[PDB]
Amino acid sequence: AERPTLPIPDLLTTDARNRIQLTIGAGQSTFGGKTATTWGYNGNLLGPAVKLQRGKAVTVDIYNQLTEETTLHWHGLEVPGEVDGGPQGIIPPGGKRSVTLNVDQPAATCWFHPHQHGKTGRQVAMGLAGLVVIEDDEILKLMLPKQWGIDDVPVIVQDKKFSADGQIDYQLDVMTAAVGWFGDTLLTNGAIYPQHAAPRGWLRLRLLNGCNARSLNFATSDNRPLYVIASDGGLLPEPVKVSELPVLMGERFEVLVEVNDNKPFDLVTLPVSQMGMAIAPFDKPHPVMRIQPIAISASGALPDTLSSLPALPSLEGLTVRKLQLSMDPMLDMMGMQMLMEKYGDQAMAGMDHHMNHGGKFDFHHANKINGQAFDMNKPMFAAAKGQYERWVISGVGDMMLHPFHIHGTQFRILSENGKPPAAHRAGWKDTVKVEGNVSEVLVKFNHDAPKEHAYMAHSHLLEHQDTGMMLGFTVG
Ligand SMILES: [Cu+2]
Numbered sequence: 001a002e003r004p005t006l007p008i009p010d011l012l013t014t015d016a017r018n019r020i021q022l023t024i025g026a027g028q029s030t031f032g033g034k035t036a037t038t039w040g041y042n043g044n045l046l047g048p049a050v051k052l053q054r055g056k057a058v059t060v061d062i063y064n065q066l067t068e069e070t071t072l073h074w075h076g077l078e079v080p081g082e083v084d085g086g087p088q089g090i091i092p093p094g095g096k097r098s099v100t101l102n103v104d105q106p107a108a109t110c111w112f113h114p115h116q117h118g119k120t121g122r123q124v125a126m127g128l129a130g131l132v133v134i135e136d137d138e139i140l141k142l143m144l145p146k147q148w149g150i151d152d153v154p155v156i157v158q159d160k161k162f163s164a165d166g167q168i169d170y171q172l173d174v175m176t177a178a179v180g181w182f183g184d185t186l187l188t189n190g191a192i193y194p195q196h197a198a199p200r201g202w203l204r205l206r207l208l209n210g211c212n213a214r215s216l217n218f219a220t221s222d223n224r225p226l227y228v229i230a231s232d233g234g235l236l237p238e239p240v241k242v243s244e245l246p247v248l249m250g251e252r253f254e255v256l257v258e259v260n261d262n263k264p265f266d267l268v269t270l271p272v273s274q275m276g277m278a279i280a281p282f283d284k285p286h287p288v289m290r291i292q293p294i295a296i297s298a299s300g301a302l303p304d305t306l307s308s309l310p311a312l313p314s315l316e317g318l319t320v321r322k323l324q325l326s327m328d329p330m331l332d333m334m335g336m337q338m339l340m341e342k343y344g345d346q347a348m349a350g351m352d353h354h355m356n357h358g359g360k361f362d363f364h365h366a367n368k369i370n371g372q373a374f375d376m377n378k379p380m381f382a383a384a385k386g387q388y389e390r391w392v393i394s395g396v397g398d399m400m401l402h403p404f405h406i407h408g409t410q411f412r413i414l415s416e417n418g419k420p421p422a423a424h425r426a427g428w429k430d431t432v433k434v435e436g437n438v439s440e441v442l443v444k445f446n447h448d449a450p451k452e453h454a455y456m457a458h459s460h461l462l463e464h465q466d467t468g469m470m471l472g473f474t475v476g
């Protein structure tokens with residue numbers, strides 16, 4: 001059979017009441033011919049791409065048609081805590097919440113997803129995620145590929161696993177609280193190995209790793225390069241040519257890739273050195289999508305310069321905040337041994353060469369920051385507004401992957417896990433790798449967040465977030 005075409009999320013803009021309507025609901029999807037209950041925004045699975053313009057405000061009306069509580073967070077968008085949609089931003093089942101977003105940051109591909117307390121991993125796994133396309137005046141002058149669904153395409157890559165009856169098989173248990181929820185089936189905008197027909201010339205891909213726990217590493221099947229033009233928070237100063245592009249959970253990059261007549265090629269993900277993630281079929285390069293060239297000229301450009309990146313300031317005299325991540329040693333070893341028992345030595349491929357004892361030992365609060373599992377009632381500190389800070393995040397003490405995300409900002413990485421950041425990671429980021437080492441980022445918060453609607457900072461390995469590896473903080 002031919003491959004299905006890559007599904008393209010609808011690009012949604014406001015009505016004359018300046019409103020965008022998002023309905024959160026359950027429906028059905030099909031994967032490998034078997035139906036599964038799934039959740040979506042304005043549909044059965046995934047969600048639309050909300051289009052925003054710098055300097056314009058939009059109101060979003062969010063209708064929760066699930067039978068459980070949820071929240072809606074705009075990952076990458078810098079907004080006041082009251083509309084950030086962290087775990088305090090509850091939307092009752094059958095209820096509606098509206099937020100007004102006053103967009104105040106450069107053009108970027110951001111995304112949105114649930115942030116329900118202790119249940120974010122399940123709600124993402126069931127299907128909820130959407131996109132945000134921010135434009136500003138600067139980016140349109142560059143004449144990048146811009147025809148949505150033709151030469152400018154979002155690529156949301158996610159794994160799932162399913163039970164024998166076809167349903168999504170999600171469990172937050174000791175093994176996944178240790179290693180994360182991951183599966184054996186790769187989805188690309190919800191579809192298994194789709195094709196996308198693209199015109200000859202440049203193709204812009206807005207890549208999102210939407211997996212709960214799996215890191216990815218994109219490349220092409222015939223080793224043509226990817227030209228990185230943007231990271232989480234917007235354009236780089238100039239394109240950065242790469243042969244492979246590691247992407248952590250929740251990160252975005254936009255790349256341009258050449259499309260040549262008569263030569264289809266795949267976007268692939270290459271095996272990663274992360275526990276559990278190189279079990280078949282991920283022990284080998286895995287196709288994500290086939291690009292099918294069409295013999296019609298594509299109009300977009302890859303300009304020499306994209307934007308101005310300001311200089312890092314002096315670090316002297318900046319507040320230094322220490323964030324020590326930790327996992328419970330006994331429960332990390334138990335979960336890792338369950339993984340090994342299940343899959344054997346392949347569960348560590350690529351890596352460097354039973355009774356109830358009560359609430360004290362419960363894995364639901366095993367993961368922590370500064371010795372505390374997330375306490376929604378007690379923000380850990382009060383950050384400065386409009387002031388740079390140096391946040392130092394340590395994963396010393398364990399070797400698991402912690403893509404560390406901070407709400408309310410786009411930051412600059414000073415050190416990523418003990419090395420200066422790669423050039424394509426040296427611009428605006430909202431995620432930094434922490435794995436067995438220490439990262440340092442330079443952050444500034446331009447908006448307030450009170451205790452009742454605090455900003456979060458957490459690992460975006462969702463099963464770790466949901467079992468305590470998150471803190472709240474206020475601004476202003
Ligand atoms: Cu996120």
Ligand SMILES: [Cu+2]
Pocket residue numbers: 073074075076405406407408
């Ligand atoms: Cu976020």
Ligand SMILES: [Cu+2]
Pocket residue numbers: 073075115405407456458
């Ligand atoms: Cu978050």
Ligand SMILES: [O]
Pocket residue numbers: 073074075076405407
């Ligand atoms: O987030």
Ligand SMILES: [O]
Pocket residue numbers: 073075115405460
């Ligand atoms: O998040």
